[model samples]
Target: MKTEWPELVGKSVEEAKKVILQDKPEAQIIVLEKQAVDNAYAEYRIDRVRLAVDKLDNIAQVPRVG
Candidate 1:
C-alpha cells in the first residue's frame, strides 16, 4: 500500500537482495538494481543498482543521513 521508493516498485526483499549481491556492493545498508531499461540508455545497460551507504530505522550506525 505504501509506494514511495519507485526504484523498488514491485520487488520483494529477497529480489532486492539479489540486485544488491549482483551489483552495488559499496552500498552500506539498502541496495537496489533496475531490471529493464530502455534502448535510449543502452550505454548504461537496462540494469542498474543503488545502495543506502548508511543505515536506517536503527539510527545507531547512520545518524547523519536517514
Candidate 2:
C-alpha cells in the first residue's frame, strides 16, 4: 500500500500545518530536516524531504455549562 503525505515544498510552516490538519485534525505536527549530499566546494544541501504524523485522541470538556 502506498502512503499519502501532504506536499509542502516551497510552502511556509503555517501552510504545511494547515495541509496536514486538513487530512488529520488530531494528528501531531513535527518539523524535520537532514543534511543532504553535497560537494566539498559546495555548501550544505537538503535532498530528501519528509513529514511524519502521529495520531492523537481528542479529549476535552466544557466547564460550567449554564
Candidate 3:
C-alpha cells in the first residue's frame, strides 16, 4: 500500500478539507468522525479520513510473445 500524502489532523471539518485541498487540488477528502463511549454519551474526537490523490504506479509490463 502506498500513500501519496501524509496523515492530516484538523480541529474542524473545514480546516481538514482546506489542508487536503492544498495538498492535492484533485484529491478527495474522506472524513471519518471519531466516537468515544463515555457510558453516558458519545464523545467525538479529531476527524479521521482517507485521502484520494494521484499516485504513481511503476509496474513494468512484459511484452506478449506472438
Collision pairs in model 3: none
| lDDT of candidate 1 over 1-66, digit per residue (tens) | 111233433445444444444444343334322322233323432233322222332112111101
Per-model TM-score on C-alpha atoms = 0.27, 0.41, 0.35
lDDT of 3 by residue, 1-66 (tens): 112233432234454455545644454555222332134324431232242222221111210100
Cα distance off (Å), candidate 2, residue 19: 0.7
- What order do candidates take by TM-score, descending? 2, 3, 1
Per lDDT, the best of the predicted structures is 2
Residue runs of model 2 more than 4 Å from their true location after superposition: 1-6, 34-66
- Which candidate's TM-score is highest? 2
Model 3, runs deviating above 4 Å: 1-10, 34-66
* Candidate 3 weakest lDDT stretch, 10 residues: 57-66
All candidates in order of lDDT, best leading: 2, 3, 1
Indicate the residue-level lDDT of 4 in model 2.
31
The RMSD of every model to the true structure, in order and in angstroms, is 11.9, 16.5, 17.0
lDDT of residue 20 for candidate 3: 46
Report the C-alpha lDDT of model 2 over 1-66, residue by residue, as the tens digit: 112343544445555555555655544554433222233234322321134322221111110101
